């Protein structure tokens, strides 16, 4: 399965999705800079509308514990 095919379900907790992401990211072998680009970009983009909304409110500069606690009720 390709990294672009990794997406969050409509009922799937973000948490279970983030695990899937760094597992697939774990099978990507690209430069770190590209993998940083993938992190800030693709993760949020394939996140579900309800959490996506939430993550837009965190702004930039956000870290994984704060994202992970931010989308917990969703």
């Amino acid at each position: 399965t390709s990294i672009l095919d990794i997406r969050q379900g409509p009922k799937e907790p973000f948490r279970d999705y983030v695990d899937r992401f760094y597992k697939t990211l774990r099978a990507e072998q690209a430069s770190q800079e590209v993998k940083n680009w993938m992190t800030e970009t693709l993760l949020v983009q394939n996140a579900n509308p309800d959490c996506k909304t939430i993550l837009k409110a965190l702004g930039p500069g956000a870290t994984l514990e704060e994202m992970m606690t931010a989308c917990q009720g969703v």
């Binding site: 948490r15 983030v18 695990d19 899937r20 992401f21 760094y22 597992k23 774990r26 870290t63 994984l64 514990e65 992970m68 606690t69």
Partner: protein, 147 residues
């Protein structure tokens, strides 16, 4: 790990498969539970950075946590470099170089280098510095993964 030989010197010996597997099994069974930290601590007795990356890299599953830890290890490493600046002028022929955050994380150092620092007189406890970062990052995880 670096262990003491019968002759009375500190030499490196490899870690055992049923030790490895015991590390695996702990993680399988007790996931993020607090008992994991003393357990870790016992199984990390006399361990190198290199052995500590081996243990972290051999995890399967809980990849959100594994990424949070990585990022904590780099933060704690960035902080090592900040707090301890590089030293004045060129490195002496008679001496060996001071470590950076990445040498502590095992990344920029070689094994023989990791054995130089620990076995040399005075010795520097680069295991114990990484160990606190691991334990600190373990607290972060435990606190988050509480429900």
């Amino acid at each position: 790990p670096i262990v003491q030989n019968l002759q009375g010197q500190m030499v490196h010996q490899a870690i055992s498969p049923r030790t490895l597997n015991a590390w695996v099994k702990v993680v399988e069974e007790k996931a993020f539970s607090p008992e994991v930290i003393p357990m870790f601590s016992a199984l990390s007795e006399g361990a190198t950075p290199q052995d500590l990356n081996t243990m972290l890299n051999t995890v399967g599953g809980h990849q959100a946590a594994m990424q949070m830890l990585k990022e904590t290890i780099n933060e704690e490493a960035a902080e090592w470099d900040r707090l301890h600046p590089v030293h004045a002028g060129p490195i002496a022929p008679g001496q060996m170089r001071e470590p950076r955050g990445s040498d502590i994380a095992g990344t920029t150092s070689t094994l023989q280098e990791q054995i130089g620092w620990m076995t040399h007189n005075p010795p520097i406890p680069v295991g114990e510095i990484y160990k606190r970062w691991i334990i600190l990052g373990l607290n972060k995880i435990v606190r988050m993964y509480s429900p």
